[PDB]
Scaffold this active site. Structure first.
Site, PDB file in Angstrom:
ATOM      1  N   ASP D  35       0.862  -0.903  -0.181  1.00  0.00           N
ATOM      2  CA  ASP D  35       0.008  -0.354  -0.057  1.00  0.00           C
ATOM      3  C   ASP D  35       1.483   1.100  -0.455  1.00  0.00           C
ATOM      4  O   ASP D  35       1.937   1.324  -0.468  1.00  0.00           O
ATOM      5  CB  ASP D  35      -1.172  -0.136   1.283  1.00  0.00           C
ATOM      6  N   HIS D 156     -29.410  -0.131  -6.712  1.00  0.00           N
ATOM      7  CA  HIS D 156     -28.333   0.493  -5.860  1.00  0.00           C
ATOM      8  C   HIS D 156     -28.929   0.938  -4.271  1.00  0.00           C
ATOM      9  O   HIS D 156     -30.170   1.744  -4.700  1.00  0.00           O
ATOM     10  CB  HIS D 156     -27.464   0.949  -6.637  1.00  0.00           C
ATOM     11  N   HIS D 157     -27.869   1.194  -3.783  1.00  0.00           N
ATOM     12  CA  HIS D 157     -27.861   1.638  -2.633  1.00  0.00           C
ATOM     13  C   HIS D 157     -28.408   2.877  -2.271  1.00  0.00           C
ATOM     14  O   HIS D 157     -28.686   4.178  -3.836  1.00  0.00           O
ATOM     15  CB  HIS D 157     -26.293   1.460  -2.275  1.00  0.00           C
ATOM     16  N   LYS D 160     -25.135   5.916  -3.789  1.00  0.00           N
ATOM     17  CA  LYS D 160     -25.050   6.321  -4.955  1.00  0.00           C
ATOM     18  C   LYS D 160     -25.854   7.416  -6.029  1.00  0.00           C
ATOM     19  O   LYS D 160     -27.035   7.691  -6.136  1.00  0.00           O
ATOM     20  CB  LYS D 160     -25.373   4.602  -6.428  1.00  0.00           C
TER      21      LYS D 160
END
Ligand SMILES: NC(=O)c1ccc[n+]([C@@H]2O[C@H](COP(=O)([O-])OP(=O)(O)OC[C@H]3O[C@@H](n4cnc5c(N)ncnc54)[C@H](O)[C@@H]3O)[C@@H](O)[C@H]2O)c1
Ligand SMILES: NC(=O)c1ccc[n+]([C@@H]2O[C@H](COP(=O)([O-])OP(=O)(O)OC[C@H]3O[C@@H](n4cnc5c(N)ncnc54)[C@H](O)[C@@H]3O)[C@@H](O)[C@H]2O)c1
Ligand SMILES: NC(=O)c1ccc[n+]([C@@H]2O[C@H](COP(=O)([O-])OP(=O)(O)OC[C@H]3O[C@@H](n4cnc5c(N)ncnc54)[C@H](O)[C@@H]3O)[C@@H](O)[C@H]2O)c1
Ligand SMILES: NC(=O)c1ccc[n+]([C@@H]2O[C@H](COP(=O)([O-])OP(=O)(O)OC[C@H]3O[C@@H](n4cnc5c(N)ncnc54)[C@H](O)[C@@H]3O)[C@@H](O)[C@H]2O)c1
Ligand SMILES: [Cl-]
Ligand SMILES: [Cl-]
Lengths: 268, 268, 268, 268
Positions: D35, D156-157, D160
């Site tokens: 990372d 979708h949630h 979005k």
């Protein structure tokens, strides 16, 4: 245009066929309509009989009297009738679309024989959507492989005596074949009590019987993170009539032979 | 604000409870978090342990150490653990939300005995949506009566051992009781071959096992011309945690007694 | 048994009503069938006309000649006809089930007036399943509260000119009223581009137009962790016929008044 | 076994990738995890960081430090980061799976330029199920032709921002191209009031925004008598991680070049 005759025209499918022919819009046109010789409906307008406007085609009782006013004959009757129709169409060199079911093995051989002389489409299921789904299921099973659990869910009305449906079983076989499994070995038809963790190879059938449902079919492919569902919902038998008419049109210019809806749809 | 403690805070439901509590927009707040004194996680922040930001609540190992720092205890652990948790809350006169399952009939009597001194919400299922559906099913069954075919369709993940789910069977029992049927007598769990036409009294179960499905439940009521479906889809165990938190807030001001989610949601 | 007359018997709904009457099994029986006086179908068996077996009841052209052979009249015609039927039934003290739509405000007042003298069921939608769902939606909205996003998804055939459907809008209004919202302020009918995060108060409509779909309606209630869906799927107009017949039976022994399907179903 | 490194290993997709790699049953194994060098998580075990058991792979901060310890790099980070990752893999001659989105047209040319020296799988969507559906849609659209109404329904949630989803629009484009339509010309995104009868060429989008829905996509093809639905339901972002891992294994033995998931899945 394509001149189409319908035999069994006063029947349930025959009426639907008349309707689907008129719904092509000059691509095709009904030129003949034949039912039982002893029918009291003989003489009536085939359009009116099917609940449509007057078409201008009378119901007749003998294919022989009209055997030259059409390019292709669509037949949804009974084996003993279709065999006679096959004879007349073969002699007159006219293409056929045969939806009649219940042929014996010997009766079937006659079909392939006539297919030496005329082009024929013969199918146990003329639904475009169902036949499309059968191909999509093969593609899906091959791409998803052994990563997914495959479950077939179907619903039909309260009067259906057989479970799961013929269509669900066919879908099961397509998937089984694509993955190199034996359907009869891996199929499960119900679950009750401590069934345990699911084996990956299992093909599960969940079958609903209820109300007036004409026929819903879903194949679920499920893995961690995602579900894929391929679904066919039937609302009437018009789906078979429309597929038969498509076959009738497809036959134009085709070589002699015995074809099915995989040929018509270009899926083979 | 309402001071909530969570016991079993390092467990699966525990972590969800921590998140559900913190999400209350300030109505409630976490003030204590207990797991096994045995735990290697003892000392770690409750927020961090649940994948949230640092909350400022270390994981304790003894309910007795923090007994006087919360208004209500939410308990998703194990029967043996809860029976002890109860006596401590009972003596400290603290309200409880008990989600722990698997109690004997005798132990339930012990819960009630404790509920004489403190308010307790005890429920087999803390999902607000599932309990709501149970009530909707009773209404639907009574209204539709013996006119409909009733089918219960559920899907769960590939590791679930029991079929149909406890939730599906409970839905079955709700409908059976509304219509004066014995569920054991009328239930059908699978369909294979010539099952014959459907008897109206039958309550059918079609059970799907596949992939990672957390839990889908549908009850279908079907008659000529129409289908009615009541459906619950769980996306995660957060549904039970949110319901438990709703109960914990509901308990505020309640007299001693043994309550369930039908009380909490006013469905009784 | 309950003696039932059907007026508009040769119509689309009238034919369905004849059918739903015979499907009660001695609970009810058709004793009269009336259509237009100038109809050439007058004299024909009402059973045969509806595609059933011979019932033994001729189609007649005047309610007045038969106005005493029945207990209750079911009417699905046209306002100008129903007004005349109301007059005859009121004088003969016979109950009514009125499914006719399109009454003017002044024509409606006559209904309430006649309801001083006879018991009447009058409803814009005689579907048992739809009316049940309307009640279930009220219960669900109240229990779930401001925790959920509410979305109404409907599908209808390719010829339907209005969107969303009257039924979807009614479902929207039930939910809006239950939560103290103004539907017209919070409704959204489409989404395109950067719409942004969803406001909790929004009631969303997702509307499908396709094929031959008779009418599917789903109300989704969605929150973190779970979805609840309440769904009605229509397959034919027989649903309205069956609800009208239920109303006709329900009316037995009822006091004079104006009732609707919420009364019939005991949901008010 | 195949040696897989993951860059962005502490990110959302990174954690999922770690899990997906470890779940390969030993076909592959994680050997490196990188990372930001900036990261406070540097040094921590990759398994522990992803909520798994200790894996024995510490989180590194420099791709260059571990450049010679993996066969393929899976990269879900950010364009600026990937452009640098590419040059290192290019010089070390290591294959890449790139899930990073948001590249300019010029940068895509740079990816291809690098793909001259190493094999690279670069895809806007790594879900096996979604890419499969894209192919199934092309087949379905070609077979069904101008006979059907095509509607794309997605959910979708509540957070979005864009509608319809990129996946829904891509599905739209697949169907439009198969039928020789301009999607921008025929797309409809909402329906309100007297929309009138549906034009056959229309591709309708019905978009649901609600709760926590990760992403449901359905394409409906409807005509008289039948509906066909092709449906994908994502339960978590693990679907993309599993697809990326499948690509990483597929790359083994492949010649240099720029590949996508249609190559990986053999759908081309
Ligand atoms: N392949 C498919 O997709 C599909 C779909 C539906 C039905 N089918 C098959 O189609 C056939 C008909 O089904 P139906 O339900 O329409 O049955 P149906 O009995 O309503 O219609 C059958 C018609 O055949 C007519 N007939 C009988 N003898 C005849 C003769 N000698 N000449 C002309 N017409 C004659 C009858 O009068 C009747 O009108 C059956 O075999 C059924 O299984 C196939
Ligand atoms: N009622 C509902 O709606 C619902 C929903 C889900 C689970 N459950 C029940 O919740 C319980 C736990 O579910 P889980 O899946 O979270 O299991 P889990 O084992 O992940 O969590 C159990 C936790 O209890 C902790 N624990 C054990 N002994 C303890 C002690 N003496 N003091 C404090 N903490 C202790 C364990 O360390 C662990 O963290 C089970 O009974 C399960 O059936 C109920
Ligand atoms: N409330 C509901 O749930 C519901 C459902 C469907 C239809 N409807 C309403 O039902 C009514 C009929 O619908 P339909 O589609 O059956 O129409 P339809 O026109 O097929 O049938 C109407 C019948 O009324 C008959 N009629 C006309 N004048 C008459 C007279 N003077 N005496 C007797 N019969 C006469 C016509 O001949 C025709 O047969 C319409 O108002 C429609 O909106 C209500
Ligand atoms: N193609 C697909 O199917 C698919 C699916 C989901 C997400 N994505 C894409 O994946 C990318 C990341 O998605 P995420 O949601 O995982 O975002 P995220 O930000 O959670 O993960 C990003 C990770 O990259 C790390 N990072 C930043 N700079 C770095 C560097 N110089 N070296 C190493 N690591 C570095 C960050 O620390 C973080 O851990 C985005 O571009 C997103 O669009 C693609
Ligand atoms: Cl209710
Ligand atoms: Cl394909």
């Amino acid at each position: 245009m394509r001149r189409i005759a319908v035999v069994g025209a006063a029947g349930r499918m025959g009426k639907n066929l008349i309707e689907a022919v008129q719904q092509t819009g000059g691509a095709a046109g009904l030129t003949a309509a034949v039912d039982r010789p002893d029918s009291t409906l003989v003489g009536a307008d085939a359009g009116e009989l099917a609940g449509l406007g007057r078409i201008g085609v009378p119901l007749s009782g003998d294919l022989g009297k009209v055997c030259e006013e059409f390019d292709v004959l669509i037949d949804f009757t009974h084996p003993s009738v279709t065999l006679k129709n096959i004879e007349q169409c073969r002699k007159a060199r006219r293409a056929m679309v045969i939806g009649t079911t219940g042929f014996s093995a010997d009766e079937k051989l006659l079909l392939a024989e006539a297919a030496k002389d005329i082009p024929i489409v013969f199918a146990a299921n003329f639904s475009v959507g169902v036949n499309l789904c059968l191909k999509l299921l093969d593609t899906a099973a091959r791409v998803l492989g052994d990563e997914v659990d495959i479950e077939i869910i179907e619903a039909h009305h309260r009067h259906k005596v057989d479970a799961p449906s013929g269509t669900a079983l066919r879908m099961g076989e397509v998937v089984a074949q694509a993955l190199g499994r034996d359907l009869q070995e891996v199929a499960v038809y119900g679950r009750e009590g401590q069934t345990g963790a699911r084996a990956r190879e299992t093909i599960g059938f969940a079958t609903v019987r209820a109300g007036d449902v004409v026929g819903d079919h879903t194949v679920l492919f499920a893995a961690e993170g995602e579900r894929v569902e391929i679904t066919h919902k039937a609302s009437s038998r018009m789906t078979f009539a429309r597929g038969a008419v498509r076959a009738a049109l497809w036959l134009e210019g085709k070589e002699n032979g015995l074809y099915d809806m995989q040929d018509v749809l270009g899926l083979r």
